[PDB]
Amino acid sequence: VSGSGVCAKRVVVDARHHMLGRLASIVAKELLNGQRVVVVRCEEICMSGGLVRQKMKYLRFLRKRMNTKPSHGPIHFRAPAKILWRTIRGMIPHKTARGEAALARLKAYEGVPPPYDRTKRMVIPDALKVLRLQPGHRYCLLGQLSKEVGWNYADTIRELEEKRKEKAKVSYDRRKQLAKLRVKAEKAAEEKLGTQLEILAPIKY
Amino acid sequence: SHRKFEHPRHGSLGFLPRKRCSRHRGKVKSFPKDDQQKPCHLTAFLGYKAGMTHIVREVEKPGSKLHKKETCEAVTIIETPPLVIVGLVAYVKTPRGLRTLNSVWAQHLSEDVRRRFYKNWCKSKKKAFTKYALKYDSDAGKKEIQLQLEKMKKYATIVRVIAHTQIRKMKGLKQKKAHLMEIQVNGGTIADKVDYGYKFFEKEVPVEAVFQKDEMVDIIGVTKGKGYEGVVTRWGVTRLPRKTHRGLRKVACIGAWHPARVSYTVARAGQNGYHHRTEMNKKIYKMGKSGQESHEACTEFDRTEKDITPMGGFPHYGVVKGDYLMIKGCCVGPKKRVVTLRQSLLKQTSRLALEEIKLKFIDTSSKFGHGRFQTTDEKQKFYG
Amino acid sequence: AHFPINASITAANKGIEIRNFLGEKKVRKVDMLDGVTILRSEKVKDEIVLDGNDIELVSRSAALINQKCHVKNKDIRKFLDGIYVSDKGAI
Amino acid sequence: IEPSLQALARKYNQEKMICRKCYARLHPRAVNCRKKKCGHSNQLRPKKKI
RNA sequence: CGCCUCGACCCACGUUAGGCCCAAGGGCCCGUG
RNA sequence: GCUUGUGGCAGCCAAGCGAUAGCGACGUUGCUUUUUGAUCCUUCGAUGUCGGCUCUUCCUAUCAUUGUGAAGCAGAAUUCACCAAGUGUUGGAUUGUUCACCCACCAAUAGGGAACGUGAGCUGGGUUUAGACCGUCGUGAGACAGGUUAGUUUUACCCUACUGAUGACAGUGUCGCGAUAGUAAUUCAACCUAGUACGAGAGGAACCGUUGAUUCACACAAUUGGUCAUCGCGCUUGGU
RNA sequence: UAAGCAGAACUGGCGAUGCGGGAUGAACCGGAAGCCGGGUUACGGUGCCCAACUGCGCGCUAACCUAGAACCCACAAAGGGUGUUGGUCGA
Ligand SMILES: [K+]
Ligand SMILES: [K+]
Ligand SMILES: [K+]
Ligand SMILES: [K+]
Ligand SMILES: [K+]
Ligand SMILES: [K+]
Ligand SMILES: [K+]
Ligand SMILES: [K+]
Ligand SMILES: [K+]
Ligand SMILES: [Mg+2]
Ligand SMILES: [Mg+2]
Ligand SMILES: [Mg+2]
Ligand SMILES: [Mg+2]
Ligand SMILES: [Mg+2]
Ligand SMILES: [Mg+2]
Ligand SMILES: [Mg+2]
Ligand SMILES: [Mg+2]
Ligand SMILES: [Mg+2]
Ligand SMILES: [Mg+2]
Ligand SMILES: [Mg+2]
Ligand SMILES: [Mg+2]
Ligand SMILES: [Mg+2]
Ligand SMILES: [Mg+2]
Ligand SMILES: [Mg+2]
Ligand SMILES: [Mg+2]
Ligand SMILES: [Mg+2]
Ligand SMILES: [Mg+2]
Ligand SMILES: [Mg+2]
Ligand SMILES: [Mg+2]
Ligand SMILES: [Mg+2]
Ligand SMILES: [Mg+2]
Ligand SMILES: [Mg+2]
Ligand SMILES: [Mg+2]
Ligand SMILES: [Mg+2]
Ligand SMILES: [Mg+2]
Ligand SMILES: [Mg+2]
Ligand SMILES: [Mg+2]
Ligand SMILES: [Mg+2]
Ligand SMILES: [Mg+2]
Ligand SMILES: [Zn+2]
């Protein structure tokens, strides 16, 4: 796996319904290559194996702790965005200055906070669950695992996300009216300059 | 190898680290859950520990050997004059937790509370809130105040009042700097809370608006400091034999060869006392209201005219002239220490919770010795 | 066998109150699941009849009643007291 | 208890099979145990009667 | 909250045993000095 | 450290006992490293060798306590098994013990690891220097893994770890948020249930409720108790 | 009984030896070497750490035991399963 090569200012990835370790693998390569990646909706990342297998995996991780000073030992983050942050860190040479810089280019969020609610959010085809998992096999959502092990901001995330989807639904209705107006405009402008646009006919889709 | 005999460990690991508190005034770490059906009310109060005395009462408790018999009980007196509301603070929800939305302050703030904003009040020009007070004079300024309040009603999910004590009423405290705290309003809708807290600006809220007799409350404060202390007193470990070379007031083994480190669970010497503590389920036996018969230490069975203050004053405190609470048992901290009183976080559906207290006698003998008189009048009539 | 089980329907249909099971002082309360009705039957001595539209919800409510009346710490081959489904059908 | 109601109560307390490994209580027509810890054993015996 | 010494162009929710589709493999932009 | 014969623990078959409630011979498969051996890899310009006291963590092959399944489970009691290491597992006589064995209490008095945890923590009763008895052995000097009695226990101010204490990090102060880390409560009794369920009888439960207590933790000093150089007051010896 | 035990036969190796792989390691696999440029391989690999496919193709597996996943090598047995998938011999 190499980088995207798309050389933008920052790519915003909609993490919903992606496989956690396959998403973290691609993002880690992007960060190591110099790209800034913003991951939103980390509460809806999917992990293969249902809730039960994933929950006991975290409980075994929660067992690990420095016997003589626990505040020194492993830090067990409960939020979905910090869980994904730590999964990515495991795939990065983070004790070197290069990996330190790579991990500083990653931003992870639960829900879609501003300004990314009004930007374009992409998907990773080879991390999507619909292309990665057989339809009958078990899986769980990151927010469900996080809620089971101590995360307490699932309700505020859900309430904010409903408000965001209402605003986006209204913006979608407005965009559909402007699209119908556009199609009428290109129809009327088609005849008004009918002769000039003959070269565009064979490549019209 | 395993230890030869079992005994439980000395001290609790749940109060770690045993350090000095970072604050002096006790802090509410969790307010009661808001029930929007109930009327708007405050959930906490500030008071000052005056002293201890003992009361006698007849117990009504079926099934107990104390039933219909009198008991002697030690009580703590907390002087609680009314608080002044001087502001409002709003909180909105956020994926990172609660966040302060905005705050609105009253036009008039006493110099006692304004001293809280200064390290050296008498060397300064005392400019705090001098320009903020100008919003209440113009008309554009009043528009901002109303706009801030309307923002509170629309966006806030938690509304808290900013209140301060009238610390100069207790002369024996010898302090002019008031104590300031945020108190949550726990009734009604958000618009109800904002309207309720705004009508209280520059107004005195008495202790009876917050608590009632025979209620279980939680007391928050900082315990008495004791400085550097050894393991025997700080943690309660046992002394070593008299024969012990280099002293006997230590822990003998502070760990095994492996792990090759000292653990956080082993008792060590350090700071003892001056810790933040939240103590719950303290019953209110009496509410002494200034200017009423309930302020006196006379009961229905004892008609002797006497005040709550013991003969010669409360030792190291002074005379209680303001409103006060009588509370069963002991209370955190020394005398004069500011204490935070909070409503119970859980439902008090219990016999001890629901018991009705009827006092038979209040001791007002001097606590500075083996006092034997209840009043100065009785002492002078005895000696001629 | 010895202690007559006393059942009381709380709402019009929603609740049942079991007391004196094996002569105990505990009160067993079972709330019928959504859409399920219960009636202390007539024409039969000690029958309760549960009614509803969903087979899983009616059968689960009968399971709740039976499982709250388990004999503890005794030989249940001898102490056969309980509330047991006697007939399941679709009216 | 009337004999007819006795038969009803024995349908749940008595007419059962017991796993000889994990002691699980099984329906009378069971041939294998329902439990993973005993490996779904076929070594079953009837529940003993009073 | 108070007090002042290198065109970096692009906002749907949701579902894949379903909503013409069958990838932005698109669209927009004097894209021209 | 390797090994696991021996030690300990767990299985498979089923002749029998009373086939598989509970057991289980003749055979046979394993696991473990708190036994003891076997080895001699590390350490001989030295890693302080027994035991106990103190203190903290850890395991589970669970003794009690929570929830259950089984019985040759009527009740009461007991036994087998499961999920379970959250909380407990004590005061003493003899002995240097470890191990043991008795007394007593208890819900119960389970088993173990951490350089056979822990000596710059103690102690020094035992082992094991030099003094000295006895028995046996030796011609003798002397020996004994046999008994007996007397026999100096050093240093931390360094680094880390741990416990607390200040503190910079683009003005200053007040009020806040809360990622993360820690964490805690525990067991028993009395009364009612009830001399009831059960049982031929003898015997004999429990839930709910109520009232207490144990172990632990965190505070506090109204009262009781303790503490004196209040050198506060009094008395008093000798001197001056 | 066994042992990273103790002792022999043939050859190689380490000791005396770097270098690539086996995460790590005297001995295992590859391969032995002056200072360099370019090309290609061995062993071993191609989701990220990590250079190289989330490559093309068929099955099997679902682990509510920490499913499983690189010679030496870092273990597992007798015995079981109406889990599931292939077969064989019969009524
Ligand atoms: K020990
Ligand atoms: K104490
Ligand atoms: K002691
Ligand atoms: K400021
Ligand atoms: K063995
Ligand atoms: K040596
Ligand atoms: K001597
Ligand atoms: K917590
Ligand atoms: K098979
Ligand atoms: Mg690569
Ligand atoms: Mg936590
Ligand atoms: Mg033990
Ligand atoms: Mg809090
Ligand atoms: Mg000494
Ligand atoms: Mg006093
Ligand atoms: Mg019984
Ligand atoms: Mg053996
Ligand atoms: Mg045998
Ligand atoms: Mg040496
Ligand atoms: Mg040493
Ligand atoms: Mg040394
Ligand atoms: Mg177990
Ligand atoms: Mg335990
Ligand atoms: Mg050992
Ligand atoms: Mg040792
Ligand atoms: Mg020493
Ligand atoms: Mg020692
Ligand atoms: Mg030492
Ligand atoms: Mg000695
Ligand atoms: Mg000697
Ligand atoms: Mg001789
Ligand atoms: Mg001696
Ligand atoms: Mg009878
Ligand atoms: Mg040599
Ligand atoms: Mg060499
Ligand atoms: Mg080359
Ligand atoms: Mg693939
Ligand atoms: Mg390896
Ligand atoms: Mg097999
Ligand atoms: Zn079974």
XYZ file of N, CA, C and O in Angstrom, chain B residues 131-190:
240
model
N -16.430 48.942 35.038
C -16.947 49.218 33.706
C -18.081 48.279 33.327
O -18.935 48.648 32.518
N -18.114 47.072 33.895
C -19.244 46.181 33.660
C -20.534 46.783 34.197
O -21.607 46.592 33.614
N -20.453 47.504 35.315
C -21.644 48.099 35.906
C -22.266 49.163 35.011
O -23.433 49.518 35.207
N -21.523 49.671 34.028
C -22.036 50.710 33.146
C -23.040 50.192 32.123
O -23.722 51.005 31.491
N -23.156 48.876 31.939
C -24.169 48.359 31.026
C -25.575 48.574 31.567
O -26.527 48.679 30.789
N -25.729 48.644 32.884
C -27.042 48.830 33.485
C -27.520 50.274 33.433
O -28.663 50.542 33.819
N -26.684 51.203 32.977
C -27.037 52.615 32.923
C -27.526 53.049 31.547
O -28.557 53.716 31.439
N -26.813 52.678 30.488
C -27.197 53.054 29.134
C -28.360 52.181 28.668
O -28.957 51.430 29.442
N -28.706 52.281 27.387
C -29.741 51.445 26.797
C -29.198 50.366 25.880
O -29.811 49.303 25.770
N -28.068 50.613 25.218
C -27.400 49.541 24.493
C -26.821 48.513 25.455
O -26.805 47.315 25.157
N -26.341 48.966 26.615
C -25.832 48.036 27.608
C -26.908 47.122 28.159
O -26.678 45.927 28.354
N -28.097 47.670 28.420
C -29.202 46.843 28.893
C -29.649 45.858 27.823
O -30.155 44.776 28.137
N -29.482 46.223 26.553
C -29.816 45.304 25.472
C -28.912 44.077 25.494
O -29.373 42.955 25.254
N -27.621 44.271 25.777
C -26.712 43.135 25.879
C -27.105 42.212 27.025
O -27.082 40.986 26.877
N -27.468 42.781 28.175
C -27.838 41.960 29.324
C -29.050 41.102 28.992
O -29.090 39.907 29.301
N -30.057 41.701 28.357
C -31.243 40.945 27.980
C -30.925 39.914 26.902
O -31.489 38.815 26.903
N -30.029 40.252 25.971
C -29.641 39.299 24.936
C -28.881 38.117 25.520
O -29.066 36.978 25.080
N -28.008 38.367 26.497
C -27.308 37.274 27.161
C -28.279 36.360 27.899
O -28.120 35.135 27.885
N -29.284 36.938 28.563
C -30.277 36.127 29.260
C -31.104 35.304 28.284
O -31.471 34.162 28.580
N -31.425 35.874 27.122
C -32.202 35.138 26.133
C -31.378 34.019 25.513
O -31.914 32.956 25.181
N -30.074 34.239 25.350
C -29.192 33.164 24.913
C -29.169 32.033 25.933
O -29.126 30.854 25.565
N -29.212 32.376 27.222
C -29.284 31.363 28.269
C -30.541 30.514 28.123
O -30.493 29.286 28.242
N -31.679 31.154 27.857
C -32.939 30.423 27.785
C -32.998 29.499 26.576
O -33.726 28.501 26.596
N -32.246 29.803 25.521
C -32.356 29.043 24.283
C -31.354 27.900 24.192
O -31.696 26.818 23.706
N -30.122 28.109 24.653
C -29.053 27.155 24.410
C -28.610 26.370 25.635
O -28.031 25.294 25.472
N -28.865 26.859 26.842
C -28.326 26.216 28.032
C -29.092 24.945 28.382
O -30.298 24.837 28.159
N -28.361 23.970 28.923
C -28.958 22.793 29.534
C -28.766 22.745 31.041
O -29.496 22.018 31.719
N -27.806 23.494 31.574
C -27.595 23.632 33.007
C -27.475 25.116 33.313
O -26.753 25.837 32.617
N -28.195 25.576 34.332
C -28.137 26.961 34.779
C -27.729 26.972 36.245
O -28.328 26.273 37.067
N -26.709 27.756 36.566
C -26.196 27.848 37.921
C -26.155 29.301 38.359
O -25.900 30.199 37.555
N -26.411 29.513 39.608
C -26.387 30.833 40.218
C -25.004 31.071 40.809
O -24.349 30.145 41.295
N -24.537 32.312 40.746
C -23.280 32.710 41.369
C -23.618 33.448 42.655
O -24.222 34.524 42.620
N -23.235 32.871 43.789
C -23.636 33.368 45.095
C -22.424 33.499 46.003
O -21.438 32.775 45.856
N -22.504 34.436 46.944
C -21.430 34.662 47.899
C -22.006 34.813 49.296
O -23.168 35.180 49.472
N -21.175 34.515 50.287
C -21.564 34.619 51.681
C -21.338 36.033 52.200
O -20.583 36.824 51.631
N -22.014 36.346 53.303
C -21.880 37.636 53.974
C -20.935 37.445 55.156
O -21.336 37.389 56.315
N -19.645 37.349 54.834
C -18.656 36.897 55.800
C -18.428 37.902 56.924
O -17.900 37.532 57.976
N -18.827 39.159 56.746
C -18.645 40.151 57.798
C -19.679 40.045 58.911
O -19.494 40.668 59.960
N -20.759 39.287 58.712
C -21.709 39.062 59.797
C -21.084 38.266 60.935
O -21.476 38.432 62.094
N -20.130 37.393 60.628
C -19.407 36.625 61.638
C -18.124 37.372 61.960
O -17.095 37.185 61.313
N -18.186 38.233 62.974
C -17.030 39.055 63.312
C -15.852 38.200 63.762
O -14.696 38.513 63.457
N -16.126 37.107 64.477
C -15.072 36.243 64.975
C -14.241 35.587 63.894
O -13.133 35.121 64.175
N -14.751 35.531 62.663
C -13.952 35.022 61.557
C -12.804 35.953 61.200
O -11.819 35.497 60.614
N -12.914 37.239 61.537
C -11.864 38.228 61.299
C -11.479 38.309 59.826
O -10.323 38.571 59.489
N -12.445 38.103 58.936
C -12.201 38.074 57.503
C -13.203 38.971 56.790
O -14.391 38.974 57.119
N -12.713 39.736 55.815
C -13.545 40.612 55.001
C -13.792 40.067 53.603
O -14.672 40.571 52.901
N -13.054 39.043 53.198
C -13.152 38.467 51.868
C -14.221 37.382 51.859
O -14.081 36.364 52.542
N -15.274 37.593 51.072
C -16.376 36.648 50.999
C -15.976 35.380 50.246
O -15.012 35.351 49.478
N -16.733 34.316 50.485
C -16.581 33.066 49.756
C -17.637 32.996 48.664
O -18.815 33.260 48.916
N -17.208 32.641 47.461
C -18.038 32.660 46.269
C -18.133 31.256 45.691
O -17.131 30.542 45.620
N -19.334 30.856 45.281
C -19.510 29.538 44.689
C -20.667 29.553 43.700
O -21.515 30.445 43.711
N -20.675 28.548 42.833
C -21.751 28.324 41.878
C -22.706 27.286 42.442
O -22.276 26.219 42.886
N -23.996 27.597 42.421
C -25.032 26.688 42.891
C -25.998 26.429 41.746
O -26.458 27.369 41.092
N -26.302 25.159 41.509
C -27.212 24.766 40.445
C -28.667 24.966 40.852
O -29.044 24.733 42.001
N -29.480 25.410 39.898
C -30.932 25.444 40.044
C -31.489 24.134 39.508
O -31.172 23.735 38.383
N -32.328 23.465 40.298
C -32.765 22.108 39.973
C -34.281 22.003 39.934
O -34.878 21.097 40.515
N -34.935 22.913 39.231
C -36.358 22.769 38.999
C -36.764 23.395 37.686
O -36.036 24.207 37.108
N -37.934 22.987 37.209
C -38.565 23.650 36.086
C -37.813 23.505 34.774
O -36.956 22.639 34.592
N -38.163 24.386 33.843
C -37.525 24.444 32.541
C -36.338 25.401 32.591
O -36.105 26.090 33.585
N -35.570 25.442 31.503
C -34.415 26.329 31.450
C -34.855 27.785 31.535
O -34.219 28.601 32.211
